[PDB]
Design a binder for this molecule. Structure first.
Ligand SMILES: OC[C@H]1NC[C@H](O)[C@@H](O)[C@@H]1O
Ligand SMILES: OC[C@H]1NC[C@H](O)[C@@H](O)[C@@H]1O
Ligand SMILES: [Mg+2]
Ligand SMILES: [Mg+2]
Ligand SMILES: [Mg+2]
Ligand SMILES: [Mg+2]
Ligand SMILES: [Mg+2]
Lengths: 781, 215, 781
């Protein structure tokens, strides 16, 4: 069995740099607390025992209420009068830092307005190892850079709005199967322990840990340790994971909270780096363990100060208002137990926090549409004589937009996946609705919507008369506690749901101007229809939230040129992706073993390595205009040589070998600041190229910079930077970025540091991972 | 909208009866669509549409939260060559279709500002719910053709004051109407005899003559 | 609020009389044990941790494995190669002590053969206060005497087979609504405590406690305390209930186990009379409480010796074999964790324990058929020209006989309710199958089966041509953790399921020889069709288990004359029964309050009090022959006067105010022996009458003896005795029974004892509660 070595003591905060003010105030607060009060900050109150998805204990003596921790990564869960934003995978498809930031801000606003202290998101774990992983859509992209950049922007948005963000799930939670034994037992599996994600040190550093480093460096206030084990130690009591990787190497200054009921070694978890136990025994035992010296006072002091530093860092002292909604009822009033008898109290204020957030949701919707094919199908005008709309995915959830709890169904248009990663829709504009409005406000031609996937006779009938047929298909997935159609969180296949492929084929056989819109959580196998000559256009539109239909028509009818690029690969087969899902336990009754044997070769890296050609490669998308790439130029910057970090920490302040050691500790060679040794972010090269709009309409291009690191075990290419750029017809721009030292380095397990190998490196600039228009060597120095 | 030949079904919003007396819709604006367009172009409040008469739980939970609840029920009929749900052209009863009455009662039990919209080919028996105090308004909208949702919201939201009058009576019972429908032959293998014994006393003339009070 | 006074200390065993040998052996065993070993007996190992629905800890030092506690009241739950017996309500309809006993023995044989130590049954609570109570079918009858007698016979059968029986649920669990807070929350109610059944002392004694007294006196080894509260104290920590009523007044010598997760005040439960905690985290707390003196040694000792006394009483020492099946999988092998690594072990031996029990299951099926109406419909011959069979209740469960988890559906023929009170069918003979077999082996006329309740055209089609039409309808219910069709355990109405009434009306409109068969867990409202002249016969057949179709046709085709009597009333309205189900919390977030305001006036007692006429009265049933009653005689037996119990216990041996008192305690005046003061069972009168079969075929009659106690608040009549008697044409018998002192007594709260009031009493012998053919005074003496 793969093994996780111990690493103690649990590092205490430095409170240097951007964390100094927050640390100073956290220290002044914690100094005033009893042991009991400090412990309260670390202890969840109990599942459904208060208002939020999780709450800490309070400190009434100082008029300090317990923190409110609330889902989700795309909105405020279990709340009324809130917005439903596009999923993270949609954000990834925008390739747009600014939009990710603004989505974060708006979500932050909504959480703040409700009294939430901690938004439980965004997500960089799962990263996206498996194309059929159930919760990938909550995150961004299998690519660590795309994910890391947009993760960071999202965090800055949330925290700038005055709410603590929570990077989750740390780490290796790449599938839902066997994530939690009780859950697996519910599915008829006999195991007593969560699966172990077995990840080698190199793979961790270069893939899964990378976006979490970005999260740390972006100033995220909290992390959530995952349900699964990593090398046969539960994330939430994995000393190597938390004490070494997170709190030493990445020098995380904030607090680590457990996933809800994520198994840990109680008091041992605290020594291994856990700061907060959710949802709530730990309170009492922590108090006792401090009193008898099993847990040193500086540990509990550090737990409390991390929590309070996060609080002050985002300005919770300024922005906090009373929690004005209840997670567990929509009723205005409810009975509560009193010291004597009961009271009848206000539990929901129905505070409307939506503001103008429908605009940014429509915009991100449009920006996340990816044009995969267009042989003269798009844009439409709205003056078409006869428009046919086809597929259940065009239509309404007949149970109401919030008719499936936690969105645990696939009724009507798919705008959101299922599980904790959800929010209630204030409304839902369907494609059927938006398309009919478009026509009836313009040319007022014929339009008919056949939204029963079994009604094939009607689809032929209508398609054969149509000037254009717009076909809607979907594929759904979500968190493991919900099973839909035999998908136990994870997808059981990469097929279109509800006979979608049949809908496409039926319509395309009858209409030679067929448009296909895919609302999918991830890739599906399209080999059998994408190349159908009668299919004149194909878009992926993902999970667009409340404005789905409107955001779509803005693109389809040409008000917005599509500018998204696919943030994952569309392969010919499931086998193309490699990394099959473990769906049968392989360690008897013990922890199943998901070995990450493919290393860094997931998604496009795998395709490139094995020379499999994608149908649509990572980073690919079309426009209503054309772009041209020219004149790459590489400038060496002659950065200072890399210095491994060195020296000591301070002694642990007060306000398993080494676990009670509060003496000064040696700094790790790759640590020394939040996000890693600062020398890693030194700029080594400046790289430029010219992008020109050679077409006839204004449009966005997403230029992409890839690096070949040049070793035999390196990917042929890895994404390193990108931007989204609006260009008028004929307009040119010089796209200039820099490559950091980290950008051109490899992880060396022996030296425990990032190294620039002697293999020659090549830089590429292009429009996708396969359309590498420009290249130049990176000259060593 | 034209998915049932000669409109021989009761799928979704009822804007046309069945048989030869039909035409194809160029399009059909549903109440769901028009009401959402109305809200989203004005106050942009919350709006949800539960359009499955079996999803009574969802209706309870949405109706409990609503400022206003707008309930839609229908009853259909048509030419005798088409049978739908055991209605051989003629209606086998004067009930609302697809458990419409239960939809009304469910919603009304959870929302004290319930509006009922009836798309019916003729009268239905409403004795059980019309006088529900939680039902704050009732309209009959008939079979409005292609602009159904739009024509409706113009009235509901006050652009047009309603000025229609019912062109038939709404009675307490089927018996109120007299003139029972002959559904089994009464002359062997020969021509059945529908005797018009009531004379000129149909609809309101019948109610008036027997001093029966219409709803 | 209603209040439950304290009663301490928790009585310890006497081991007198019938328990002396068991007590002696239990003492010898417990004498050898450490404290930890004693506590192990009291502590369940945890939910699904071992093989049985529950297991105690083991004592391996002496080669003593943990006890195996296993559902259900009608078979071996969660096991293969077992039989599915008829439900308790069917046993009640037989009015047959002998059949009840033989069912006990057979179930006991099967449990024994699997290695089970405790069968978790039979059921006398719910008794049947509400006609819509979800679990009534697991019990017997709303009548306390009928239930008590058959309860006792079942117990004797199980225990005679070498298995410990368990009387449940004690007490007041008359509905599923709000039985457990978590479950109520799951259904969207906001409460934090179980409902409280508020029952006055007299009602308890004269109604709900009565059958449980019978169970004690029959020698039952264990009791299970219920989920609900009684007078605002949870049954399992209710000192009045367990210490006073059960262990003092009824002088119960066996052990009390909790219902699974039935809430108690932890260590204080033990002081209040709880002996065993299921399923499991109190083991170490009980150990500590004994060490620090909060729980006396004599108490834990008494707990251990009660458990072992039950063990030795039924001869577990002789009959125990290893547990040879697993509750949680049907796999033959499985993994188990070890001191190091894992062991692969045998988990299912597939031991076939069914023997010949299909015979008794068929016989009880037939004996539990109640003929409610017969105007020349029955019996059939099998030489009918055309037989129509109608209704889904005639057909197969299309998912397999065991295709619904815990029988939590209403697919095909209803032969068993849902929840924990179940077992798997080895097979299930449907009415469709058995009727076709009957026709095709005899006259070979036409036969067709329309088993889709929506197929009304086809029913009209076929019924028009039929010589006879046999219609099948059902109504289902069960345990509260399962909801079917909006029935949250309890029934939401007293309607037939799946449009059964429309089936009946459709068929009766087209066939003037329509027979209706009802498989219902309890009464339904039949007012609209029972008096239809086209309905020539009506039978209730209940939940017949595996031989349903065969047992039924044995009766329909005249091999067995029906002799069952309805063990509950068939009323005109729901309101007829009074006692409406509380389905809405009425104490805010606190325990709902269920006031048993009707007192002893449930089922027939209510109908009699209000002079309301039932459609079919309690105790009513027809035969293929006629019976005549004559010549009643009453013999006074001049019993000794009643003597209150006196004297004191011995002091508590070792091997809240009064809770730790181990000193000799005074015997309650209505106590003294298992089941109450022995003087209560003195015979006061012998009552006899002549029964004659005056018809042309052999049949069974169920003569019934009713008593009028004569007080202003007494029921007009209460059942006191009954028998089932087979009589050939022209055969006479003398039916003779005796009335005990208990039988003619009332409970007096002031004196805490049974009293024979001065009001004149009248005895009635008849063929139902309303058909009282003979009567006589009971001369005072
Ligand atoms: O609902 C709280 C918590 N539950 C479990 C999920 O894994 C996590 O993402 C979520 O934040
Ligand atoms: O299954 C164990 C246990 N669960 C709870 C039920 O109330 C009881 O009857 C049953 O024995
Ligand atoms: Mg609450
Ligand atoms: Mg540090
Ligand atoms: Mg096991
Ligand atoms: Mg005693
Ligand atoms: Mg009740």
């Amino acid at each position: 069995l793969a093994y996780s070595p111990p690493f103690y003591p649990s590092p205490w905060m430095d409170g240097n740099g951007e964390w100094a003010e927050a640390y100073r105030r956290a220290v002044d607060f914690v100094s005033q607390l009893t042991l009991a009060e400090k412990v309260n900050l670390t202890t969840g109150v109990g599942w459904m025992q208060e208002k939020c998805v999780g709450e800490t204990g309070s400190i009434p003596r100082l008029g300090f209420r317990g923190l409110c921790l609330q889902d989700s990564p795309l909105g405020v869960r279990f709340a009324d009068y809130v917005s439903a934003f596009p999923a993270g995978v949609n954000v990834a498809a925008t390739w747009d830092k600014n939009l990710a930031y603004l989505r974060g801000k708006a979500m932050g606003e909504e959480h703040r307005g409700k009294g939430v202290d901690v938004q439980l998101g965004p997500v960089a774990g799962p990263l996206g190892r498996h194309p059929d992983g159930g919760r990938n859509w909550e995150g961004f992209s299998p690519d660590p850079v795309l994910t890391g950049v947009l993760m960071a922007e999202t965090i800055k948005g949330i925290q700038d709005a005055g709410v603590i963000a929570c990077a989750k799930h740390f780490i290796g939670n790449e599938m839902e199967h066997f994530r939690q034994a009780s859950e697996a037992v519910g599915y008829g599996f006999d195991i007593t322990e969560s699966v172990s994600s077995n990840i080698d040190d190199k793979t961790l550093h270069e893939l899964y840990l990378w976006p979490f480093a970005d999260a740390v460096r972006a100033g995220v206030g909290s992390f959530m340790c995952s349900y699964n084990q990593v090398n046969n130690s539960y994330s939430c009591s994995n000393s190597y994971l938390l004490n070494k990787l997170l709190k030493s190497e990445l020098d995380f200054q904030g607090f680590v909270v457990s996933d809800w009921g994520a198994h840990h070694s109680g008091v041992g978890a605290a020594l291994a780096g856990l700061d907060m136990s959710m949802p709530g025994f730990w309170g009492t035992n922590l108090t006792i363990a401090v009193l008898n010296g099993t847990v040193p006072e500086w540990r509990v002091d550090d737990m409390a100060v991390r929590i309070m530093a996060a609080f002050y860092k985002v300005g919770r002292d300024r922005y906090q208002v009373p929690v004005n909604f209840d997670s567990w009822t929509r009723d205005e009033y409810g009975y509560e137990h009193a010291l004597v008898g009961q009271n009848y109290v206000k539990v929901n204020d129905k505070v409307d926090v939506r503001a103008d957030h429908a605009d940014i949701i429509r915009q991100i919707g449009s920006a996340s549409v990816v044009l995969l094919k267009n042989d003269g199908g798009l844009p439409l005008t709205g003056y078409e004589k006869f428009t046919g709309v086809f597929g259940e995915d065009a239509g309404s959830n007949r149970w109401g937009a919030n008719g499936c709890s936690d969105r645990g169904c696939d009724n009507g248009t798919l705008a959101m996946g299922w599980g904790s990663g959800t929010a209630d829709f204030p409304y839902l504009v369907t494609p059927e609705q938006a398309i009919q409005n478009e026509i009836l406000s313009k040319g007022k031609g014929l339009v008919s919507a056949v939204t029963d996937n079994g009604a094939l006779d009607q689809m032929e009938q209508v398609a054969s008369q149509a000037s254009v047929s717009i076909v809607f298909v979907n594929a759904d997935s979500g968190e493991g506690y919900i099973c839909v159609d035999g998908n136990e969180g994870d997808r059981k296949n990469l097929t279109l749901w509800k006979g979608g492929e049949e809908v496409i084929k039926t319509v395309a056989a009858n209409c030679n101007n067929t448009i296909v819109v895919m609302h999918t959580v991830g890739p599906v196998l399209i080999d059998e229809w994408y190349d159908n000559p009668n299919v004149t256009a194909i878009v992926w539109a993902g999970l667009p939230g409340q404005e789905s239909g409107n955001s779509l028509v803005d693109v389809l009818y040409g008000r917005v040129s599509p500018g998204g690029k696919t943030p994952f690969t569309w392969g010919k087969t499931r086998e193309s992706y490699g990394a099959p899902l473990l769906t049968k336990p392989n360690n008897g009754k013990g922890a199943p073993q998901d070995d990450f044997t493919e290393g860094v070769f997931i998604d496009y890296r795998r395709f490139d390595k094995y020379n499999e050609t994608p149908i649509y490669e990572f980073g690919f998308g079309l426009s209503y205009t054309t772009f041209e790439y020219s004149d790459i130029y590489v400038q060496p910057l002659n950065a200072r040589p890399y210095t491994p970090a060195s020296g000591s920490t301070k002694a642990a302040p007060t306000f398993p070998s080494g676990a009670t050691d509060g003496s000064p500790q040696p700094i790790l060679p790759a640590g020394g600041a939040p996000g890693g040794n600062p020398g890693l972010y030194d700029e080594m090269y400046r790289v430029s190229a010219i992008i020109t709009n050679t077409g006839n309409v204004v449009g966005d291009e997403v230029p992409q910079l890839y690096v070949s690191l040049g070793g035999p075990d390196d990917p042929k290419v890895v994404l390193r930077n990108f931007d989204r750029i609006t260009l008028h017809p004929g307009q040119q721009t010089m796209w200039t970025t820099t490559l950091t030292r980290r950008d051109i380095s490899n992880w060396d397990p022996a030296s425990q540091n990032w190294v620039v190998t002697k293999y020659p490196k090549t830089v590429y600039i292009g429009s996708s991972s396969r359309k590498l228009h420009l290249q130049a060597p990176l000259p060593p120095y």
